[PDB]
Design a protein around this motif. Structure first.
Motif, PDB file in Angstrom:
ATOM      1  N   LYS A  38     -10.895  10.769 -11.285  1.00  0.00           N
ATOM      2  CA  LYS A  38      -9.543  10.944 -11.720  1.00  0.00           C
ATOM      3  C   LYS A  38      -8.545  11.095 -10.610  1.00  0.00           C
ATOM      4  O   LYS A  38      -8.740  11.822  -9.617  1.00  0.00           O
ATOM      5  N   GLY A  39      -7.388  10.491 -10.804  1.00  0.00           N
ATOM      6  CA  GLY A  39      -6.240  10.670  -9.927  1.00  0.00           C
ATOM      7  C   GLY A  39      -6.472  10.301  -8.475  1.00  0.00           C
ATOM      8  O   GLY A  39      -7.125   9.259  -8.168  1.00  0.00           O
ATOM      9  N   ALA A  40      -6.020  11.160  -7.575  1.00  0.00           N
ATOM     10  CA  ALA A  40      -6.098  10.887  -6.153  1.00  0.00           C
ATOM     11  C   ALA A  40      -7.465  10.994  -5.507  1.00  0.00           C
ATOM     12  O   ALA A  40      -7.620  10.694  -4.307  1.00  0.00           O
TER      13      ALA A  40
ATOM     14  N   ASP B 294      -8.545   6.810   5.967  1.00  0.00           N
ATOM     15  CA  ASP B 294      -7.809   6.994   4.743  1.00  0.00           C
ATOM     16  C   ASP B 294      -7.503   5.669   4.054  1.00  0.00           C
ATOM     17  O   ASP B 294      -7.372   5.635   2.843  1.00  0.00           O
ATOM     18  N   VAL B 295      -7.232   4.644   4.856  1.00  0.00           N
ATOM     19  CA  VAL B 295      -6.821   3.302   4.341  1.00  0.00           C
ATOM     20  C   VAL B 295      -7.632   2.246   5.094  1.00  0.00           C
ATOM     21  O   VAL B 295      -7.842   2.393   6.292  1.00  0.00           O
TER      22      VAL B 295
ATOM     23  N   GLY C 207       4.775  10.468  -4.471  1.00  0.00           N
ATOM     24  CA  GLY C 207       5.761  10.433  -3.387  1.00  0.00           C
ATOM     25  C   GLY C 207       5.522  11.434  -2.296  1.00  0.00           C
ATOM     26  O   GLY C 207       6.259  11.439  -1.307  1.00  0.00           O
ATOM     27  N   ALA C 208       4.492  12.249  -2.453  1.00  0.00           N
ATOM     28  CA  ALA C 208       4.275  13.322  -1.548  1.00  0.00           C
ATOM     29  C   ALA C 208       3.661  12.898  -0.254  1.00  0.00           C
ATOM     30  O   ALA C 208       3.774  13.613   0.744  1.00  0.00           O
ATOM     31  N   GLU C 209       2.899  11.805  -0.257  1.00  0.00           N
ATOM     32  CA  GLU C 209       2.280  11.330   0.951  1.00  0.00           C
ATOM     33  C   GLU C 209       2.733   9.880   1.143  1.00  0.00           C
ATOM     34  O   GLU C 209       3.265   9.251   0.232  1.00  0.00           O
ATOM     35  N   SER C 210       2.436   9.363   2.333  1.00  0.00           N
ATOM     36  CA  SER C 210       2.860   8.056   2.713  1.00  0.00           C
ATOM     37  C   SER C 210       1.826   7.553   3.769  1.00  0.00           C
ATOM     38  O   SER C 210       0.724   8.116   3.906  1.00  0.00           O
ATOM     39  N   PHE C 211       2.196   6.565   4.550  1.00  0.00           N
ATOM     40  CA  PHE C 211       1.345   6.253   5.731  1.00  0.00           C
ATOM     41  C   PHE C 211       1.393   7.297   6.857  1.00  0.00           C
ATOM     42  O   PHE C 211       0.603   7.243   7.766  1.00  0.00           O
ATOM     43  N   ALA C 212       2.397   8.176   6.848  1.00  0.00           N
ATOM     44  CA  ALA C 212       2.553   9.123   7.901  1.00  0.00           C
ATOM     45  C   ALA C 212       1.297  10.007   8.003  1.00  0.00           C
ATOM     46  O   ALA C 212       0.842  10.596   7.036  1.00  0.00           O
ATOM     47  N   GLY C 213       0.696  10.050   9.196  1.00  0.00           N
ATOM     48  CA  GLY C 213      -0.519  10.792   9.387  1.00  0.00           C
ATOM     49  C   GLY C 213      -1.817  10.189   8.904  1.00  0.00           C
ATOM     50  O   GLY C 213      -2.880  10.780   9.079  1.00  0.00           O
ATOM     51  N   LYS C 214      -1.761   8.991   8.278  1.00  0.00           N
ATOM     52  CA  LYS C 214      -2.999   8.335   7.802  1.00  0.00           C
ATOM     53  C   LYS C 214      -3.737   7.585   8.879  1.00  0.00           C
ATOM     54  O   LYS C 214      -3.083   6.983   9.757  1.00  0.00           O
ATOM     55  N   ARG C 215      -5.057   7.548   8.751  1.00  0.00           N
ATOM     56  CA  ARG C 215      -5.925   6.806   9.666  1.00  0.00           C
ATOM     57  C   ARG C 215      -6.257   5.504   8.932  1.00  0.00           C
ATOM     58  O   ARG C 215      -6.728   5.540   7.762  1.00  0.00           O
ATOM     59  N   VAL C 216      -5.938   4.385   9.597  1.00  0.00           N
ATOM     60  CA  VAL C 216      -6.036   3.065   8.980  1.00  0.00           C
ATOM     61  C   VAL C 216      -6.957   2.181   9.796  1.00  0.00           C
ATOM     62  O   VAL C 216      -6.698   1.921  10.973  1.00  0.00           O
ATOM     63  N   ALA C 217      -7.981   1.700   9.167  1.00  0.00           N
ATOM     64  CA  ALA C 217      -8.903   0.752   9.737  1.00  0.00           C
ATOM     65  C   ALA C 217      -8.500  -0.651   9.331  1.00  0.00           C
ATOM     66  O   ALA C 217      -8.450  -0.970   8.114  1.00  0.00           O
TER      67      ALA C 217
ATOM     68  N   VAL D 230       0.874  -1.216   0.000  1.00  0.00           N
ATOM     69  CA  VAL D 230       0.000   0.000   0.000  1.00  0.00           C
ATOM     70  C   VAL D 230       0.889   1.236   0.000  1.00  0.00           C
ATOM     71  O   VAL D 230       0.486   2.226  -0.594  1.00  0.00           O
ATOM     72  N   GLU D 231       2.093   1.196   0.613  1.00  0.00           N
ATOM     73  CA  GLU D 231       3.010   2.310   0.452  1.00  0.00           C
ATOM     74  C   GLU D 231       3.316   2.622  -0.990  1.00  0.00           C
ATOM     75  O   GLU D 231       3.377   3.824  -1.342  1.00  0.00           O
ATOM     76  N   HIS D 232       3.430   1.602  -1.862  1.00  0.00           N
ATOM     77  CA  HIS D 232       3.645   1.872  -3.288  1.00  0.00           C
ATOM     78  C   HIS D 232       2.388   2.505  -3.923  1.00  0.00           C
ATOM     79  O   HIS D 232       2.503   3.347  -4.818  1.00  0.00           O
ATOM     80  N   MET D 233       1.229   2.036  -3.552  1.00  0.00           N
ATOM     81  CA  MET D 233      -0.030   2.630  -4.041  1.00  0.00           C
ATOM     82  C   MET D 233      -0.136   4.117  -3.662  1.00  0.00           C
ATOM     83  O   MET D 233      -0.411   4.965  -4.510  1.00  0.00           O
ATOM     84  N   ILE D 234       0.207   4.430  -2.426  1.00  0.00           N
ATOM     85  CA  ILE D 234       0.142   5.826  -1.932  1.00  0.00           C
ATOM     86  C   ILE D 234       1.183   6.639  -2.686  1.00  0.00           C
ATOM     87  O   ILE D 234       0.877   7.764  -3.130  1.00  0.00           O
ATOM     88  N   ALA D 235       2.406   6.124  -2.800  1.00  0.00           N
ATOM     89  CA  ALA D 235       3.445   6.841  -3.540  1.00  0.00           C
ATOM     90  C   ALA D 235       3.049   7.152  -4.979  1.00  0.00           C
ATOM     91  O   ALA D 235       3.221   8.279  -5.497  1.00  0.00           O
ATOM     92  N   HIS D 236       2.503   6.170  -5.647  1.00  0.00           N
ATOM     93  CA  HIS D 236       2.060   6.348  -7.032  1.00  0.00           C
ATOM     94  C   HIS D 236       0.898   7.364  -7.121  1.00  0.00           C
ATOM     95  O   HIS D 236       0.942   8.296  -7.932  1.00  0.00           O
ATOM     96  N   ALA D 237      -0.070   7.247  -6.223  1.00  0.00           N
ATOM     97  CA  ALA D 237      -1.219   8.137  -6.264  1.00  0.00           C
ATOM     98  C   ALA D 237      -0.846   9.595  -5.950  1.00  0.00           C
ATOM     99  O   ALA D 237      -1.555  10.503  -6.411  1.00  0.00           O
TER     100      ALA D 237
END
Ligand SMILES: NC(=O)C1=CN([C@@H]2O[C@H](COP(=O)(O)OP(=O)(O)OC[C@H]3O[C@@H](n4cnc5c(N)ncnc54)[C@H](OP(=O)(O)O)[C@@H]3O)[C@@H](O)[C@H]2O)C=CC1
Ligand SMILES: NC(=O)C1=CN([C@@H]2O[C@H](COP(=O)(O)OP(=O)(O)OC[C@H]3O[C@@H](n4cnc5c(N)ncnc54)[C@H](OP(=O)(O)O)[C@@H]3O)[C@@H](O)[C@H]2O)C=CC1
Ligand SMILES: NC(=O)C1=CN([C@@H]2O[C@H](COP(=O)(O)OP(=O)(O)OC[C@H]3O[C@@H](n4cnc5c(N)ncnc54)[C@H](OP(=O)(O)O)[C@@H]3O)[C@@H](O)[C@H]2O)C=CC1
Ligand SMILES: NC(=O)C1=CN([C@@H]2O[C@H](COP(=O)(O)OP(=O)(O)OC[C@H]3O[C@@H](n4cnc5c(N)ncnc54)[C@H](OP(=O)(O)O)[C@@H]3O)[C@@H](O)[C@H]2O)C=CC1
Lengths: 460, 460, 460, 460
Positions: free
Chosen positions: C365-367, C314-315, C215-225, C205-212
């Motif tokens: 579209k996109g993100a 978020d995830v 590279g600007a966002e990551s898991f940092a600060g994300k809320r994950v269920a 999922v880090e690769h999915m976030i990076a692609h979307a």
């Protein structure tokens, strides 16, 4: 197919079988059997292997080992081992090919094979023979088994060698089973197995005589020329004598020993036993020919076969090796008044010999003909009794001599009747002419195998 | 246990066995046998496998292969192979479950199994069937063996398929052994195996008729309605005719063939032989219904079973497939005066049919009742003779037809007596009422297996 | 094919794979792959077996055992064992089928399989689990082996069970080899195997976030269920926390545990460790309600999944079991602003959920799109590290944790990039639309297997 | 030993090896190696077997199968399979015998073997080839295995055939293992294996050029005549081109294709790819010789070898088959100024050719000599990379192309240096004369095997 190597003995056996099938109505009725012949004639499997072994001086020795697993439609592969310096693939293929159809004529569930080595037992000590057998079986063991392939004896492989072979199989595989036949009586052998092949030859010939002479003649007082002096020849000679026939000759690889009076004299059991003991020790008949018991009764002929030297004779039982009755020898037998010739040896007669016998049969009515029986019919009693040894081992019981001998007799009678009746069906002779036992035996063995192969999907 | 898939045929078989055990004093005497029932009802092993094979057009085909190894307490797994487009795990579990207890009734050491494929032989060439068999056995071989699991025929698997399967087993495993039964005469088969199941059904019903009628009646003069036209039907019909009975019906998957005069006429052996030849070629009864030999003597009833169309009838032998006698058809047979029905086919009667027959038995004394025998008792002769084919292969010998048939008769008589005696012991009928052969047979087979399982630690 | 039993889970997995293949250019370029689909979808081999075992009171217990050996073109069968009361052939076929394609995405030589039992570890003692494992391996051992089939854990099968299974395999087969993965560190285990699946899901999922986000966002600060609270959920949670994300939920079979402040709070590693300890002892999350430290921070929701109760997130990482995200739950996640969902669990999303996520991707579209990754891609880290365990065992050496984790990372990145690239190639999205990771991963795994199968003659 | 059959190819290989060992100081230092030579020259094991298979018309076909397992002191038996109508035991023994010593020169643990069939792929469909491979492997499987005997390709056996072979092995034996090399990249293959043999030939020749010319010359701008157009020839040609050499000829079984300007023109990669695609389809170079891209650039010569038709030439790489450079051809090469000839093909040069090259070497100092390298040295890169494929499979990992190519290069350099240094030690040339690579390679391969055999007790 000029990639295929020239194998003269195999090709000889194949051509004879094939020619008998062609000289009949078989392929008019079942033309599709031509495909069966093409399939059956290429062995299912062949294993060849190096055998390194140690002589009594501690020196490395090398020999070649073989097992030809020719056909298994009717049963596990079955057939003996030959230790002789002539051995190669060609020879063992002839023998394994013959074995298919011989086995089929027994009525038992045995496929066809054969194996052995170019190891020569002559000049070796018992200890050398033991070390060789140990090394041989070390490789062979992985390819054989009581439901896969069951070897046995042949030239150069006696109960002694089967013992060393069996002991090593047991050591390697940690199983006690009917993996070999010709075993010792206390360790899974069958009574009548030593006697079986030579007794069966003689039994078969009795049926030939009964048919040809309408029961008028028997072995009583007939003069019988035998060649060889090993397992087949010894017990053929003993059965002939038991039936009141007279054995006028034996032989070995160095010469022939012939009674001086062939009209009235015979080897005796005691003489045969003496010869047999020399053979256990890998010695030649020549050693005893000047002893008291022999110098006056017999003539020893170095370098000769018996056939042209026995005078007038009634029955010939070549019992040594392949191609040991030439066409010239055959003509000599015919001129000497021989009327029955059966192969104790596998492929004992050359093609020229066979052709001479069969032309004589076609030219001379009834008892006037010399009647030739091929080895696959006449010598099948050995393998038949091996099948009964397998059956004993599977039952975990031992039968009586009388029980085994009775089955042997029935098997040999059925084998004769099947060759006779099949020859009448597919290759009907002219009026008063004896049916060809060679053609009939060949067709009857071949069709049983071809049809089982078809049922099993080996050809279509 | 709502995770378990719904398997209607297996559940049917299980429920009828269980219900007969419950309706007896078995679980009063041996309440612990409820544990045995729960264990035995889950198969020891099942193998499912993809079978890819090539049709005559060169095209890839896919079918499902199965082997259910249900229970091995009494012997290696034993039971046939069914090639039919209905085949699935439920069907093969019903069959293998039935086989456990059927085999127990034979007295021989045979566990229960069954296998096969959804491959449909109809519309295929012989070559297609050969390639399928080759592919099926390439996977099956590793799971089976003369002391592990020995398959045989069933719907869609004849001696032809056994041949292709055996041949491939031998090629793969390099062994000639009793891994299949139904084999050809020259390659390990048994005499009487073709006849065995149908013969045995009729032998079994002879005991039924003798008992119910105190020896006053036999098959002689009785009208017998048969369904199916394959191995079981053909030889049941032939034995009925030999005994002086009249076969009034046969049928196939497309229709019934009924004699016009069911009061007086019968199928003949020549007519049975014609139908049999059509079935060898995978053709339908419909093809001959316009021939001279057939058009005037019989009526063809497409889509119909024989039971309501034969008029008054004395015996019914369903010999085609499971669930081929409905409750309505059972009521019709009862109204038509039928007094004996035994299953040639496995689970031939529906539960409603069985319930009708047993209610009739309970309501009608002696020979006034219709008496129902289950397939595990009546149809056991085939598997019995397969156990004798295994015996013969282990002995490496072949028995005569009279020897096999005599053993078959003894087995079917003991089976009948065991079922009768066990019913009298555990489910004793009211005075004058025939004992339940289905309950007696079920108890007798089940207890033998259950006790052997306990002895072997499978349950405690 | 109305003979075939209904297998809902397997049919669901099959249909989703087939549908993604159809909704692409794959069968325009390679129409012959429809043959490969028909062949691959029938398992090469399935073994089912009774498992009799003894409980702590001395009583006989019976359960069902299974091993589905689905495909072996790319390697020995590989996949875990599930002990859960739901287990049946349907479920294990869905699992084994999924495993073929999952294993293909790892780059390692692993075929697909899965097995287990309806044995329910809940309410059993450790001694009872030991005796079960001993009995289950007694039958399973003959079907498996380091180069044949290598099982591992799944629901209900942890390192404890792997130990009892390994010891019994060793005892039976007298071999020490890589027959199982998930083994203990001193007896052939791999570092990072416990962490592998959950870590790999997060790495993917880090690769999915990076692609979307370039590279600007990551898991940092994300809320994950997260759902579930076993091996996958625990380590997924721990890796999220390590990366600076917040884990807002975990769940078990009886309910969900959700932080009260889902905008700002998270599970901590100590909390996850306490949940892990409960689960080693087969206890429920629900116990934690009695503890004020947890009650103050979290809400326990019996009978609820987390998805509609976590507010804005978020995830989502479903990590418990199949079909645990419904279409309505998917709509709630979309509405709550979730942009990434990846299956930790096998077939974690229902078909309605998948369809909702994929429709959303195509429309946004996109993100702005929610991006769905299938289990065969995102959960492949476990089996990847099992393949590394096999490699360590074949090497007879143990790698460092850093080495293993480095390889796991490269495998997850390669997996992501293959799914992305294959979708761009065969199912090219409209401008600005994210490529389908489910279609891309399905085509990538399927084509690799189908081509290898073709090369190997499984279809033509 | 006149029982032994005449095997002209085997005897040719044996006599050449033996003559090189005699023409040295080896048996003065180690006279006991004469016993090793006598032992080593008799194969450990040979399997021959019938192969029955079905053609596209549904007809039974028969071919002969073989596996020669020559020596296993250094490792499991290793070597390819040849499907060609010339195949027989003699040919496969030459090849298996060569393989022993070739393998020894690689440094890896690989014994020597070879196998194949007289099956001719030409004129067969892919489906016929698949059915043949299936049938062949059905027997071969029992004799091979990743630690016992690992086959591979050769004439008539490409990655296609290795695929069908592997798939059937897997189906039969239920194992996924390094039982064959030359496998597909997704199912246990090695990068660089297609390229390996022709790259290695060229790599070896680079070392020859470097040594003979003291680093002054290379392949850059050299004219290279190649024969064959299969796997060895293709990739030899491509490496020559990559190094800036010019390929002036290729050939096949029907003729030679030669550039019209041999001073300055060359085949190109695109032309080689075209030829390679014809060869995948079992077609002849003749088909393309009138196309636009070929008619003007090349001359096609039916029935001719290239050697006398290329004009002046620098390097000759026979790459087709045994005995494809006659003594007259050798004299022509020498007269055309050829200075390097290395065997891509096994036993590519006739004895007369070899004798011509070695007499030239002994008569002409340094770079003035034609320097001949035998196939066991120069073509060993294929088998070496097969050993690396085995090593990959054992590790359960796949290496990079660069990693494999680097190992290949080191292996070929070591092989050249060992042949050179051993020739200097045991057969020291006169001043300024190049050492015999044939003698040195033969001695170095032979002594490594002889000494391992002694250590293992194979001789004493
Ligand atoms: N034993 C069996 O059960 C069966 C054997 N056969 C066949 O019977 C024949 C004899 O076998 P068997 O008695 O068992 O073998 P033995 O080794 O016991 O005896 C063979 C005899 O033939 C002689 N002999 C062998 N090779 C040659 C040869 N090349 N030239 C001349 N004489 C030779 C031997 O001579 P010397 O004593 O000088 O060595 C010896 O007298 C063979 O053809 C065999 O295949 C047939 C059916 C069964
Ligand atoms: N063979 C044996 O040793 C034994 C067999 N059985 C049982 O006897 C029965 C018959 O077996 P067998 O005679 O060997 O098989 P065969 O295949 O030889 O014959 C089956 C007969 O039943 C018909 N049939 C099959 N399926 C159906 C169906 N679904 N609906 C209607 N008719 C059908 C066939 O029709 P068609 O000809 O149109 O194809 C054929 O007439 C089965 O229940 C079998 O399990 C019992 C004990 C032993
Ligand atoms: N372990 C591995 O390496 C891999 C596992 N997977 C998959 O991940 C999932 C979780 O596996 P894993 O963590 O190993 O297993 P565990 O047994 O460790 O955890 C399973 C979790 O899911 C819950 N659960 C199980 N069945 C159900 C159900 N039917 N309804 C609701 N909740 C349920 C359990 O609840 P409770 O605690 O109440 O029992 C437990 O919280 C599965 O889908 C598995 O196939 C995927 C790749 C690899
Ligand atoms: N592949 C390997 O790894 C190795 C191969 N070798 C040896 O290299 C040689 C070539 O093998 P490889 O390229 O793999 O095989 P291929 O089948 O790919 O090519 C063989 C080539 O030689 C030709 N050819 C084969 N037999 C004959 C013949 N009897 N007469 C004339 N031409 C013939 C073929 O002609 P056509 O195209 O007309 O059929 C074809 O061009 C052989 O000697 C082989 O043993 C050596 C080391 C490794």
């Amino acid at each position: 197919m000029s990639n295929l190597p020239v194998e003269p003995e195999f090709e000889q056996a194949y051509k004879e079988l094939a020619s008998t099938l062609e000289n009949s109505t078989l392929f008019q009725k079942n033309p599709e059997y031509r495909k069966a012949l093409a399939v059956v004639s290429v062995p299912e499997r062949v294993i060849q292997f190096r055998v390194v072994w140690e002589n009594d001086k501690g020196e490395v020795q090398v020999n070649r080992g073989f097992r030809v697993q020719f056909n298994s439609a009717l049963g596990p592969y079955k057939g003996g081992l030959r230790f002789h310096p002539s051995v190669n693939l060609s020879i063992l293929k002839f023998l394994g090919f013959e074995q298919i159809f011989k086995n089929a004529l027994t009525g038992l569930n045995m496929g066809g094979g054969k194996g052995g080595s170019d190891f020569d037992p002559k000049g070796k000590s018992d200890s050398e023979i033991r070390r060789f057998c140990v090394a041989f079986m070390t490789e062979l063991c992985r390819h054989i088994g009581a439901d896969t392939d069951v070897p046995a004896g042949d030239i150069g492989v006696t109960g002694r060698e089967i013992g060393y072979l069996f002991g090593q199989y047991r050591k390697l595989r940690n199983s006690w089973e009917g993996v070999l036949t010709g075993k010792g009586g206390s360790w899974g052998g069958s009574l009548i197995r030593p006697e079986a092949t030579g007794y069966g030859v003689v039994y078969y010939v009795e049926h030939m005589i009964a048919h040809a002479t309408n029961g008028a003649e028997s072995f009583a007082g007939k003069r019988v020329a035998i060649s060889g002096s090993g397992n087949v020849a010894q017990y053929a000679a003993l059965k002939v004598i038991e039936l009141g026939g007279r054995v006028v000759s034996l032989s070995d690889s160095q010469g022939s020993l012939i009674v001086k009076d062939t009209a009235k004299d015979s080897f005796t059991p005691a003489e045969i036993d003496a010869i047999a003991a020399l053979k256990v020790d890998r010695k030649q008949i020549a050693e005893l020919v000047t002893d008291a018991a022999f110098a006056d009764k017999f003539t020893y002929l170095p370098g000769q076969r018996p056939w042209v030297h026995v005078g007038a004779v009634d029955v010939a039982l070549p019992s040594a090796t392949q191609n040991e009755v030439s066409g010239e020898e055959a003509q000599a037998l015919i001129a000497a008044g021989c009327k029955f010739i059966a192969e104790g040896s596998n492929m004992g007669c050359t093609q020229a010999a066979i052709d001479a016998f069969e032309a004589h049969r076609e030219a001379n009515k009834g008892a006037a003909a010399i009647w030739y029986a091929p080895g696959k019919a006449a010598n099948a009693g050995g393998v038949a009794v091996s099948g009964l040894e397998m059956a004993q081992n599977s039952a975990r019981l031992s039968w009586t001599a009388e029980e085994v001998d009775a089955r042997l007799k029935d098997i040999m009678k059925s084998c004769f009747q099947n060759g006779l009746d099949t020859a009448k069906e597919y290759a009907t002779p002219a009026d008063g002419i004896l049916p060809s036992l060679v053609t009939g035996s060949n067709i009857a063995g071949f069709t049983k195998v071809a049809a089982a192969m078809k049922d099993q999907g080996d050809w279509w």
